[PDB]
Design a binder for this molecule. Structure first.
Ligand SMILES: Nc1ncnc2c1ncn2[C@@H]1O[C@H](COS(N)(=O)=O)[C@@H](O)[C@H]1O
Ligand SMILES: Nc1ncnc2c1ncn2[C@@H]1O[C@H](COS(N)(=O)=O)[C@@H](O)[C@H]1O
Ligand SMILES: Nc1ncnc2c1ncn2[C@@H]1O[C@H](COS(N)(=O)=O)[C@@H](O)[C@H]1O
Ligand SMILES: [Cl-]
Ligand SMILES: [Cl-]
Ligand SMILES: [Cl-]
Ligand SMILES: [Cl-]
Ligand SMILES: [Cl-]
Ligand SMILES: [Cl-]
Ligand SMILES: [Cl-]
Ligand SMILES: [Cl-]
Ligand SMILES: [Cl-]
Ligand SMILES: [Cl-]
Ligand SMILES: [Cl-]
Ligand SMILES: [Cl-]
Ligand SMILES: [Cl-]
Ligand SMILES: [Cl-]
Ligand SMILES: [Cl-]
Ligand SMILES: [Cl-]
Ligand SMILES: [Cl-]
Ligand SMILES: [Cl-]
Ligand SMILES: [Cl-]
Ligand SMILES: [Cl-]
Ligand SMILES: [Cl-]
Ligand SMILES: [Cl-]
Ligand SMILES: [Cl-]
Ligand SMILES: [Cl-]
Ligand code: NA
Ligand code: NA
Ligand code: NA
Ligand code: NA
Ligand SMILES: [Zn+2]
Ligand SMILES: [Zn+2]
Lengths: 429, 430
């Protein structure tokens, strides 16, 4: 009578002993691919009606880092999909007051969104799926949900998910991740898959009449069509856990008539500003473009690296939060300057190369750091502690370069390792 | 039992990739297992610095550079690599008297040129460089311990010789583990000098046994032992060095530590031949690395080696016959990057429909197949020839997809990043 989770079998799968905080189990569990070393991942994208703000940046940069860890560090094979919500009540209302038109507006703010991602060094996904391009597939998806007796059609022409029918099934549980958050309709908790459209509203043809997709049906449709019956990872901010993500699971479970559409559901914590979530609704937001007029990409990525992806974070404006980010950015910059110049200008003809005790000591700390970072990454993508490991290492390399006789080959190897980690962080020096 | 036995490392607590390597100790492909965790301690015999390096030298150092890059960059093993510089040697001594420029100055000259040649070929420097001139004191202490364990004796002239018969008697010791069939002052003709009493007009060093110079092989056991210790994961070199140089290193180090296995995996690269014979200084058939670089680029030379399995022999056709294919491959890669970078830049999100089409699905399917083919090849004793071919086939389809199909920009980025990742593992630069 309470929801259960099935862990993937380990037979035939890439095993790293990675553990992640899974919202389906409300706990840290071992990450195991559904197939081989493959990771099918779907991530909720923006509604393109306005600029993106620092809170959006927190989620997309945090999960960009995680993706980089998964691909660049652990050498998993990741296929990532992001939707663009270019049809929405919000897009419609903003397009009338601006009088610029449904599509011109969606395309404008989609452009600015990818430009903002580009500025933060956020990698593009393998696939981008616009809702406008998938309306035909949404209708076919909805039709099968009805064919499976888990959705019904109102007289106005709307289609609603039948929660009671879905629960009835022993194979299904509704609201797996937030159980306690639960005239035309059967039950008040039923939500629309297809919304009948007024003559003055944009609409699409359907077997049930002119209408528009409902709030959650799009994400289940596109992810199912591109990634199929089992997603390894589905991600988003914690606010989307209920009702958006829980409703995605009900739709996809109802469509495929199975019990687990997602193995691992990851939720980033919110960025708060003066104790409240950064939200357009609260008019407390800092745009990404505004943030880049005072701080660089490396500095902003360091800020997110310092805050565990799954915890809440508080941003103090006026740069109180960014002081530490700027100090770390400075130490990284100067470190690379010295080690690069020393590498480039080092002359072997004049240098004595005997492997000294200081060389042995630095090397030992270097290999210890590699292990500390590996354990940190396995521990739910603990970048704050991995970043500290790099800083401690750099403190000792700095001492060695200044005083000790330098083994050039050792310094090269150290530079290569730190480049590799910084590429995993998305830092660029 | 008249045949050497090999101890495979335990698998418990160690990184297992299912990599297989051609281990000259077993004369076979065996699963590679680190001695400790994911660490690999690796020692590689370096050059003798009395002259220029040639294409055969290049083949071995580039081949093992690629292998090192695969182990580190692809499989994420933790590798410590040591290369010696043989800057004391009969040849160095003979040339420095003919030139009258002086022993260290001459060795330092050709050492400089060796490293400039490696940098031109994009060969990464090892973690540790050990000059013999810097380790002669340690060489002497090493010899002392070998004598204390009764595995070496001192001639009256002041030379010190390894005692093969004493060494073989031990049940724990077997002499010539890798070429069993290749086996006056001395007890037996098969004994070899660890320390040689000093010839007149030759440089010399003090020792408890008199003025002398290290013998041919003692340096490599000494430096590898002092920095890496009693068990090397990997020891590498050209196949000609397997016997007597590498088998004698094993006898020296086993005698020093009095144990049974100093090296877990011994890798020997194949020779580069020119007109059916090994490229050799003695045969006067060699092409210098510098000479080669006036006609061909680093990428082209590395592609030449990528196409030939590291442990096979390869025949180099001169006048650029063998380099024709390499230059074609390098040009196709250059054009590929020029094109894919332009298409990425010119992509307009307003301009393009982004629906995940069946052509997008087909290219992606091929892309993931290529990743697995390349993984299987790297596990298959570092089969770069078959991996390079996999990249070439993929690039051909990406070229077709770009010309006609409506392109998924994110897919193209992922593909370009993977190819950059594989090309970095190859030491290619585009
Ligand atoms: N203050 C905040 N802190 C962290 N993440 C935040 C956020 N606000 C939204 N998201 C997240 O940003 C993404 C895009 O939001 S959307 N659907 O376009 O409004 C979603 O994953 C939200 O949870
Ligand atoms: N385990 C390791 N230890 C040390 N250096 C390592 C490394 N893995 C990669 N590099 C290094 O990281 C870079 C690979 O680029 S990439 N894949 O896009 O991040 C190169 O500079 C490698 O030498
Ligand atoms: N024709 C050839 N093909 C491939 N490898 C060759 C080679 N000649 C020498 N080496 C190799 O190049 C390295 C240089 O060492 S030394 N003692 O200075 O010559 C050794 O590992 C030789 O086996
Ligand atoms: Cl499952
Ligand atoms: Cl993302
Ligand atoms: Cl991979
Ligand atoms: Cl506009
Ligand atoms: Cl940037
Ligand atoms: Cl600044
Ligand atoms: Cl902070
Ligand atoms: Cl120097
Ligand atoms: Cl970097
Ligand atoms: Cl044995
Ligand atoms: Cl052993
Ligand atoms: Cl090498
Ligand atoms: Cl010089
Ligand atoms: Cl170069
Ligand atoms: Cl033999
Ligand atoms: Cl060591
Ligand atoms: Cl020799
Ligand atoms: Cl061979
Ligand atoms: Cl040229
Ligand atoms: Cl050329
Ligand atoms: Cl080049
Ligand atoms: Cl060839
Ligand atoms: Cl490259
Ligand atoms: Cl490039
Ligand atoms: Na139920
Ligand atoms: Na919520
Ligand atoms: Na014996
Ligand atoms: Na030989
Ligand atoms: Zn969604
Ligand atoms: Zn050697």
């Amino acid at each position: 009578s309470l929801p259960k989770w099935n862990q993937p079998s380990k037979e035939g799968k890439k095993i790293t002993n990675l553990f992640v905080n899974n919202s389906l189990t409300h706990s840290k569990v071992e990450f195991i691919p559904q197939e081989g070393n493959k990771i099918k991942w779907y991530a909720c994208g923006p509604t393109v009606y306005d600029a993106a703000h620092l809170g959006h940046a927190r989620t997309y940069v945090s999960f960009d880092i995680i993706r980089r860890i998964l691909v660049n560090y652990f050498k998993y094979d990741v296929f990532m999909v992001i939707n663009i919500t270019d049809i929405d009540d919000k897009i419609i209302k903003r397009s009338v007051e601006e009088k610029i038109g449904f599509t011109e507006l969606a395309r404008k703010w989609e452009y600015e969104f990818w430009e903002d991602m580009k500025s933060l060094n956020v990698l593009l996904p393998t696939a981008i799926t616009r809702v406008s391009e998938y309306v035909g597939d949404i209708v076919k998806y909805i039709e099968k949900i009805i064919e499976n007796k888990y959705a019904y059609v109102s007289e106005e022409g709307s289609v609603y998910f039948d929660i009671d029918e879905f629960k009835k099934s022993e194979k299904h549980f509704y609201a797996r991740m937030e159980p306690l958050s639960v005239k035309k309709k059967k039950n008040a908790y039923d939500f629309a898959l297809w919304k009948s459209s007024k003559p003055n509203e944009p609409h699409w043809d359907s077997p049930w009449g002119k209408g528009r997709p409902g709030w959650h049906i799009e994400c289940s449709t596109m992810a199912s069509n591109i990634l199929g019956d089992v997603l390894d990872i589905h991600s988003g901010g914690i606010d989307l856990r209920f009702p958006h993500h829980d409703n995605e699971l009900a739709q996809s479970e109802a469509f495929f008539d199975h019990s687990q559409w997602v193995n691992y559901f990851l939720h980033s914590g919110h960025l708060h500003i003066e104790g409240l979530k950064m939200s357009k609704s609260l008019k407390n937001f800092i745009t990404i473009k505004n943030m880049l007029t005072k701080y660089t990409s490396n500095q902003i990525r360091i800020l997110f690296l310092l805050n565990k992806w799954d915890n809440f974070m508080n941003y103090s404006p006026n740069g109180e939060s960014m002081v530490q980010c700027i100090e770390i950015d400075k130490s990284f910059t100067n470190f690379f300057a010295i080690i690069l110049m020393k590498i480039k200008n080092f002359d072997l003809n004049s240098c004595n190369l005997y492997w000294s005790d200081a060389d042995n000591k630095l090397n030992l700390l270097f290999r210890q750091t590699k292990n500390k970072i590996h354990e940190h990454f396995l521990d739910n993508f603990n970048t704050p502690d991995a970043l500290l490991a790099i800083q401690k290492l750099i403190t000792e390399i700095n001492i060695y370069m200044d005083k000790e006789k330098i083994q050039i080959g050792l310094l090269l190897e150290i530079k290569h390792y730190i480049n590799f980690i910084f590429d995993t962080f998305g830092l660029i020096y």
